[PDB]
Amino acid sequence: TQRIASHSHVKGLGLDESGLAKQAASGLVGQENAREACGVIVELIKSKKMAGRAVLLAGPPGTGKTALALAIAQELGSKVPFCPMVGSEVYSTEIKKTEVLMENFRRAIGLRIKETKEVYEGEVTVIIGLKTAKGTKQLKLDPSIFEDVIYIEAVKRQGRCDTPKGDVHKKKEIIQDVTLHDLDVANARPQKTEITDKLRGEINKVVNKYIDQGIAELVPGVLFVDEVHMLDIECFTYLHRALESSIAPIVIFASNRGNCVIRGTEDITSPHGIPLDLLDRVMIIRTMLYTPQEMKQIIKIRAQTEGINISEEALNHLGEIGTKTTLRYSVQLLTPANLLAKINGKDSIEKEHVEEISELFYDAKSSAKI
Amino acid sequence: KKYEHVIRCRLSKRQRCLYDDFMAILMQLRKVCNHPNLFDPRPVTSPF
Amino acid sequence: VLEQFLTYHGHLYLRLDGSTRVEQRQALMERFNADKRIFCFILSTRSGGVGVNLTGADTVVFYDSDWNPTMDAQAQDRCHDVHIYRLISERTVEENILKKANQKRMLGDMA
């Protein structure tokens, strides 16, 4: 059991079959409007018909939009690809600024490829006779390969020791999932900046030739983009052409601050750090405000999930200290109080334990008052 | 004088996942219950 | 499967199966005297009960259910120090399989 996972209390979205959003379901209790908004988004992803749409998330810091994106990614499973990215990851020194947002739309889209291959399980003898438990067959061998099984696609030695049954020629169906940016890197690097005429022209045509008939299967992905309110205006310029395309998969944006100044012009202000030409092209989703009853409920659910059973007085103290200063402080008061209970020998956590831990550790507003 | 020794063994997690995957030729079901010979527990050597 | 397992321990063994030729079986059976670094000998249920085998073999360990009446009775007749070890799975269906096998062996011995 790997205890490190931060936002953990998620089984899914908790949406019922009748479209109603159940409150006490799947751990994430609350945010009914966000779940009813994402119930259309998950159908848009599952239908695989319309693509190239932007969903912007907004609200106070700490509403659980990362847990909502994780709930969407766990509803989709391992079949639909999910590519997370923040706004600071696109910046580099040797890699240009317009290279990461170009390659995100290629790493998001996946392709299922089923290939039939052969394996020669010959033992010992350029003419190499492959000896099996059925018979010996000679094959014309290339002058390139000089130095048990081999690799016959387009040379593993040994494998046994007596001084490996089976036929000479075999077949097997390998079923894999390859992203388009892996295809681009393999094109660039035989046995980084992608030139446009290959990345858009030839790769799409050969993927159409694979889909062209039966073989592969195209699966779109989900691109999660956080820290959009501090992104450069040139990345916004490339993003305007990225949304104006038919080959782009679904992208979910996340904004944090209320109003900002766009990096690149450094004079004009804008709500949520996004100019009007890009803010017109997104789907605005707004989160709600927390209540102390749901606050105590989600702290109790997180504590019962991780490892800790808490009595009523310490739950009231956690609810009060979350109402006053910080919810994440009430999240972080769980494990040192459990450690203090393990040192003192108590099986549970009383009011005195969380009182002493709140006396030791400080807050953010309390540090601002000092 | 000779005697017999009875030693009982236990199962594992992947085997119980396989037993859950069965009920999810009756002679082929009896071979996997001893050792997983039909299915492949190995991520086998596949040329990419 | 057993040849895929037992060759990664630093030991060398042989084969006694039902697919080799008769002269190959004779050439293998003439080469079991004074073996070097060999402690395990592999037989079978149908091609292993052909006739005269090695007399110095001990520590009989069984692996699977034979699904046939009067199978280990021949092993007890050939062995009679030899300790008998069997693989029994817990909380499975194979307990009733071993009970039915013991009932078939008792009905074969009492016949």
Side-chain angles (χ1 to χ4, degrees), chain A residues 117 153 172 176, chain B residues 45-48:
Chain A
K117 292 180 181 179
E153 184 175 1
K172 64 182 181 180
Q176 291 180 357
Chain B
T45 302
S46 66
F48 293 99

Side-chain angles (χ1 to χ4, degrees), chain A residues 351-368:
Chain A
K351 186 177 179 180
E352 293 179 353
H353 294 89
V354 292
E355 183 178 1
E356 290 293 327
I357 297 301
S358 179
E359 182 67 28
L360 291 172
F361 294 100
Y362 290 162
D363 291 330
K365 186 177 180 180
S366 179
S367 66

Side-chain angles (χ1 to χ4, degrees), chain A residues 107-157:
Chain A
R107 73 176 65 250
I109 301 170
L111 188 65
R112 183 177 292 171
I113 299 169
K114 297 182 181 180
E115 289 181 352
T116 300
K117 292 180 181 179
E118 68 271 15
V119 172
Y120 289 103
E121 294 180 353
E123 294 178 353
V124 281
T125 42
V126 176
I127 296 169
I128 297 170
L130 296 174
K131 184 176 180 180
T132 60
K134 299 293 183 182
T136 62
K137 291 181 181 180
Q138 294 179 356
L139 293 175
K140 301 285 102 175
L141 198 277
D142 290 330
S144 66
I145 298 169
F146 182 74
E147 69 271 15
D148 252 311
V149 300
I150 61 170
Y151 62 101
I152 178 66
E153 184 175 1
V155 188
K156 240 61 120 18
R157 259 320 95 196

Side-chain angles (χ1 to χ4, degrees), chain C residues 27-41:
Chain C
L28 289 172
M29 287 297 291
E30 288 179 354
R31 292 180 181 177
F32 287 107
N33 289 319
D35 291 331
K36 292 181 181 180
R37 293 180 181 177
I38 296 170
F39 294 100
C40 296
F41 296 100

